[PDB]
């Protein structure tokens, strides 16, 4: 029919996946054991016993977080052969994850996806969750991308990558792995939803008033945005029906496949007495730079495409009024040769949050996917850090001692340098 596979790599990917699948089950009413008391069948496969199991592959080169999954309250929801561990990790090194450690485990991983796919008939592709600062989350993600493209060349693929941020950063070599994984992955992906940890951290500090947001809050919010993105795939919507329609509507050119994602509104649970924010107010909040998942200035860049995804008790006429109000502005600058409209898909299922988190349920909400040239600067900062290290050949021996050639770094840098040019080319 229409089926999707979820792939989770590394610690960040696995924890985001925990949050996302927990929220999916809470939204669809699936009990933690998997027994449901179907348009959503795209993300869950049912068995003879009525047991709905996710099509999720939890991958890690070290077993700590996967074991955390196996001892959690969702232990019986996932199948034991769908969760893959290892005895040695990459130690924050893209070279170890991609070249050394990844060889011993990629075959088993691909076999597991093969068994998952033989239960599928209408696969559109994979939704890969991973990060940029990790050795596993970059190296094995890249190798899996390459092997899947070799194996599923017709099929589509998406990322939900995590942009490194200093406050929660763990390694000093994060720009190295980010540049390496981007250079190798740019060819085998259709649409990447980068998320900046500094943006989420700031939202939790400001909107949610959390003094020290730990990883739990970050993954909960990221699950909210990811679920809001995939609702069209899971709730039988009128737009973005399959994974190909994403890249058709948001990625008009091969290289530039990096949309900017915005979620509104964000209200702390302790502010439960909040009055319901109107459609106009949240529509305005969409374009406020203080509520974006990647830190950049869309005001200072030129758009390429844009789409709205509403949720809740939302009436189309008020949506059209808000769109008309926003359109007659000088702050929105599309290019001079492309459809200067908003592909507005409207959903009516109410927004629902995790019972227990610091977010409060809001009767209506909205997400905004805008492919623009602003996010370009979000790349440049990374390159800056890269330019500060490879010039002195700092830390390069750790990579070269695990099966990587030194000049590759330069190539990778050059690639994103070229990427940057494309951003000014369209702008």
């Amino acid at each position: 029919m229409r089926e999707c596979i979820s792939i989770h790599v590394g610690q960040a990917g696995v924890q985001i996946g925990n949050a996302c699948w927990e929220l999916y089950c809470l939204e669809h009413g699936i009990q933690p054991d998997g027994q449901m008391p179907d348009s959503f069948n795209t993300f869950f496969s049912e068995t003879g016993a009525g047991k709905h199991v996710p099509r999720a592959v939890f991958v890690d080169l070290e077993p700590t977080v996967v074991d955390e999954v196996r001892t959690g309250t969702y232990r019986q929801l996932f199948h034991p052969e769908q969760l893959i561990t290892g005895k040695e990790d990459a130690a924050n090194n893209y070279a170890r994850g991609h070249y050394t450690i990844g060889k011993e485990i990629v075959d088993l991983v691909l076999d597991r996806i093969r068994k998952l796919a033989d239960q599928c008939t209408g696969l559109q592709g994979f939704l890969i969750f991973h990060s940029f600062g990790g050795g596993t989350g970059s190296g094995f993600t890249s190798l899996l991308m390459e092997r899947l493209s070799v194996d599923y060349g017709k099929k589509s693929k998406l990322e939900f990558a995590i942009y490194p941020a200093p406050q929660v950063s763990t390694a000093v070599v994060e720009p190295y792995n980010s540049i390496l994984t981007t250079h190798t992955t740019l060819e085998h992906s259709d649409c990447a939803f980068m998320v900046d940890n500094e943006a989420i951290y700031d939202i939790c500090r400001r909107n949610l008033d959390i003094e020290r947001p730990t990883y739990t809050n970050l993954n909960r919010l990221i699950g909210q945005i990811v679920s809001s993105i995939t609702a069209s795939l899971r709730f039988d919507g009128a737009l973005n029906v399959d994974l190909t329609e994403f890249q058709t509507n948001l990625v008009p050119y091969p290289r530039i496949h990096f949309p900017l994602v915005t979620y509104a509104p964000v209200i702390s649970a302790e502010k439960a007495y909040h009055e319901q924010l109107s459609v106009a107010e949240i529509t305005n909040a969409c374009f406020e730079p203080a509520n974006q998942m990647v830190k950049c200035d869309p005001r200072h860049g030129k758009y390429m495409a844009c789409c709205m995804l509403y949720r809740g008790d939302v009436v189309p006429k008020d949506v059209n009024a808000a769109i008309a109000t926003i359109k007659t502005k000088r702050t929105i600058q599309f290019v001079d040769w492309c459809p200067t409209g908003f592909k507005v898909g409207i959903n009516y299922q109410p927004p629902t949050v995790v019972p227990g988190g610091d977010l409060a349920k809001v009767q209506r909400a909205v997400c905004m996917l805008s492919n623009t040239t602003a996010i370009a600067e979000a790349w440049a900062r990374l390159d800056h850090k890269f330019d500060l290290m490879y010039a002195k050949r700092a830390f390069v021996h750790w990579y070269v001692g695990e099966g990587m050639e030194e000049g590759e770094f330069s190539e990778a840098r050059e690639d994103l340098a070229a990427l940057e040019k494309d951003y000014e080319e369209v702008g």
Partner: protein
């Protein structure tokens, strides 16, 4: 995952025994090996340094001089160690590197390597080894280097952490040691991935200038060394995200291989957070004798222990990085890493630990360099080694490599973006 502890020589055995006693007190394991603490956090990562069968340390104890058996067996933790793991020779080395490296180390090295093999094959996954030894003597230094070389050629893919103490005249005032120190630093540069360069001069200075003591014996010095060892391994022993294991620690802290010598620091010395943050960077709190403001740090790991607010420590670490931004190299973005753990060390409520790869360490080697220049150019005690299967060429090449290391540290100190 597991770490196979190794200690050699009198100093190595003493500091290792102190390390084991302190971490056993922290982890709630009694002197008989059983657990009697009252936290879940203590057992989350207890397999790293212990074996369950009661908990048994994963240690091998080596000393050519055979008396130190009973001393080790007379400590508060003398019966927990595996009796086979004691690998002691018959005769002492007499503070000669060549004696412990060519004529008498070469006999007991086989048995100690076999014991190491037996300990390593019992682990599902191994991070690496930690050698607590001494660079001034002839048993710790020469034997330590020989075992490091043998293990590195036998386990090419294991991280070889070590702890080394550089001797000072203010502690012993013996004259032959700098030859052993130079010959050992040669192997440490060549065949090691990270090193916590402890200085006896620094410990004497802290004990005298600060603690207001006559600073006798090895009790207080080993107490301070034990505290620092507990602080530095706090991240590996307890659950956390910064430097979860030895390889992640080395990747985080060591750029430019052969430049992996670290300046430890601990506080308080035996109370609000801001004074902890100010003191832990201060020159009065370095176990390697130098001024950290005389050099530029390349990498820094700061570990806080106790109950404290995270926002305050983050603010103060940001403030320190901002104020002293002259001393932090600008070509390593975000080179200061920060970890906070809940369990304080035994007897202390609020504690701070610092590990810094800094260029200031260069002046330490220069110091040792001059001491070597004070004797090698005078042909002092040369035949003591030439009669033991040693050649002057090794002395010359060790001097050259140490001088090249000094030059490297100076070059990376002077470099700019």
């Amino acid at each position: 995952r597991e770490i196979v502890h190794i200690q050699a020589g009198q100093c190595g055995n003493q500091i290792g025994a102190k390390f084991w006693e302190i971490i056993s007190d922290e982890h709630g394991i009694d002197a008989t090996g059983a657990y009697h603490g009252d936290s879940d956090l203590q057992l989350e990562r207890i397999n790293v340094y212990y074996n369950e069968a009661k908990y048994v340390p994963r240690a091998v104890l080596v000393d050519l001089e055979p008396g130190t058996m009973d001393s080790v067996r007379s400590g508060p933790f003398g019966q927990i160690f595996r009796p086979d793991n004691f690998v002691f020779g018959q005769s002492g080395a007499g503070n000669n590197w060549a004696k412990g490296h060519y004529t008498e180390g070469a006999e007991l090295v086989d048995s100690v390597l076999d014991v190491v093999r037996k300990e390593a094959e019992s682990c599902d996954c191994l991070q690496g080894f930690q050698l607590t030894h001494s660079l001034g003597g002839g048993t710790g230094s020469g034997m330590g280097t020989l075992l490091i070389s043998k293990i590195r050629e036998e386990y090419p893919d294991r991280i070889m952490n070590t702890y080394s103490v550089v001797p000072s005249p203010k502690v012993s005032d013996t004259v032959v040691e700098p030859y052993n120190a130079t010959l050992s630093v040669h192997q440490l540069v060549e065949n090691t991935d990270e090193t916590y360069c402890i200085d006896n001069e620094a410990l004497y200075d802290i004990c005298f200038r600060t603690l207001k003591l006559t600073t006798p014996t090895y009790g207080d010095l080993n107490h301070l060394v034990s505290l620092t060892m507990s602080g530095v391994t706090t991240c590996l022993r307890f659950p956390g995200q910064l430097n979860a294991d030895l390889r992640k620690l080395a990747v985080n802290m060591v750029p430019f291989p052969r430049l992996h010598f670290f300046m430890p620091g601990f506080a308080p010395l035996t109370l609000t957070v801001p004074e902890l943050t100010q003191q832990m960077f201060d020159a009065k709190n370095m176990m390697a004798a130098c001024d950290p403001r005389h050099g530029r740090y390349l990498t820094v790991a700061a570990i806080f222990r106790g109950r404290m607010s995270m926002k305050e420590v983050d603010e103060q670490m940001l403030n320190i990085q901002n104020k002293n931004s002259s001393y932090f190299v600008e070509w390593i973005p975000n080179n200061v890493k920060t970890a906070v753990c809940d369990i304080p060390p035994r007897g202390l409520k609020m504690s701070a630990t610092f590990i810094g790869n800094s260029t200031a360490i260069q002046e330490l080697f220069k110091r040792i360099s001059e001491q070597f220049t004070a004797m090698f150019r005078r042909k002092a005690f040369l035949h003591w080694y030439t009669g033991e299967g040693m050649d002057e060429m090794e002395f010359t090449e060790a001097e050259s490599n140490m001088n090249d290391l000094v030059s490297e540290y100076q070059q990376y100190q002077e470099a700019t973006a």
